Amino acid sequence: MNDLMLDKSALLFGVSKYLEKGIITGNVLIHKSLLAELERESNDGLVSAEIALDEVKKLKDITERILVNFEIVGDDSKKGEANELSREYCLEKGCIIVTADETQKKICDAMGIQYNFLQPLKQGLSFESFFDDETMSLHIKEDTVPKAKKGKPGNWKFVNLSDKPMLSTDVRMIANEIINAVRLIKGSFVEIERRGSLSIQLGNYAVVITRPPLSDGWEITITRPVVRKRLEDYNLDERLIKRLEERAEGIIIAGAPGMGKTTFAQALAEYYMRLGKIVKTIESGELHDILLLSRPDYTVYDEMRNDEDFKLYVDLRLAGVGMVGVVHATSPIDAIHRFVNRVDIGTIPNILDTIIFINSGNVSKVYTLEMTVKVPAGLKEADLARPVVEIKDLATGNTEYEIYVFGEQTMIVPVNRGITMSNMEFKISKIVNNIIPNATVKYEDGEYVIVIPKEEIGKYNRKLVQRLKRLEKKNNIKIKIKLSD
């Protein structure tokens, strides 16, 4: 029968449930230095420490029922961290470290200490049934009846959920459930722990748990996300809603500054939340690591303006996280050019699929990104068929921009630009070719190149020169004359 040494994370994340359920088995040890560290931390006002000490009490009763020992062991007065102390003891005496912390796993691995990593247990949460259609948040105060904030932003009342107050223990039980649940609900994390306050994101909920010294008793606030302008208030057409529900995973919200992009992004987020999705907001990589650990369904990235932002977006998309990125931009070129060189042409629609422009608080235009293989706009040679991303207007289905590799950078090209070029090559060509039939005309790096065979150069006269210059100034282009071979 094995000796199980429980670390902090074990106590903090419901180890007694695992003993009760038979998932782990053994006689139970806590190092005296962990108990002391928890007592100190509780006295200095930490919420997590009190939850761990509640777990210790829970352990006394479970160990008795499953007929195992429970002992506080080890060297009172040794200099050290409790976790390194617990590890040292196990190295000396042969116990197994029980942990919920990935870091313990690696250290114990390296040191030759056997460990049992607690896999998250699918517990469920008692409180979620207190959320009406009109209930925005939940309020739990020690020696008070539990209350719900019902109504709307700027217009709400508190409504008592029950006629019975809640004792300290009742509030802490709810705290414990929430902390415990952080390990299994997507997108959840412990934000910041201060003396008397613990702030948690549990899926879409914002949780704040307070205690003395900060508040007079044990308190919990749980707030659901609320928006003043819902997605339905933009009156989006069926084609777009359908696309947002069924297809769109890499989304960009564009438009000039001051047009209502943040408001729209928040509205789309909340709508996805109503569809069951967990949606987190970054308000510009620990944010990389924490988000890729928690993996929500969507992340809203508000104000992408630095290389960092664009890299993170790409990374999150490649790890399978949906994105709603907000970019100040007046055109699709401005909206997405910072993306198209980070990945392969073919990969681009795996990064971005939908661009939504916002004009004065309204959706003005939406574009889609779909991969194809084709000959780009204003190019003759079928031999130059290649991967292109077509950027289409959603309303019309019309291809308006193309993305492809020319030379050794990925260009976003308006179809109008390619058309213009081709038309200009032809207008120049028929003028030259009327005099010099063997002359070629081709656009290359900012100039229209007329190549004349050296045998036929005599034919290049002042009449022809004047006409080309007129072509130059009327169309604002550069013509260049070269000689063959």
Helix axes 82-93, 102-111, angle to 10 degrees: 40
Class of domain 3-117: alpha beta
Contacts (Cβ under 8 Å, ≥6 apart) of 301: 282, 284, 309, 312, 313, 323, 324, 325, 326
Asked if residue 84 lies in contact with residue 103, where contact means CB atoms within 8 angstroms, the answer is: no
Q: Are strands 219-223 and 135-141 parallel, antiparallel or unpaired?
A: antiparallel
* Residue 267 and residue 251 in contact, taking contact as beta carbons nearer than 8 Å: no
Way it was determined: X-ray
The angle formed by the CA atoms of residues 91, 97 and 98, to the nearest 5 degrees, is 175
Q: Are 301 and 325 in contact (CB under 8 A)?
A: yes
First to last CA, the chain: 90
In the CATH scheme, what is the code of domain 231-417?
3.40.50.300
231-417 has the same fold as 3-117? yes
User: Which among 379, 418, 385, 343 has a CA at the least distance from the CA of 369?
Assistant: 343
Cα–Cα distance, 326 to 302 (Å, whole number):
5
Q: Which residues contact 87 (CB under 8 A, 6 or more apart)?
A: 97, 107, 108, 111, 113
Given a contact cutoff of 8 angstroms between Cβ atoms, the answer to whether 199 and 192 are in contact is: yes
Per the DSSP assignment, residues forming a β-bridge with 155 are 152
Documented resolution in Å: 2.3
Residue in 376, 402, 400 with CA at minimum distance from that of residue 389: 402
Residues in the chain that come right before a backbone break, where C and next N are over 2.5 Å apart: 284
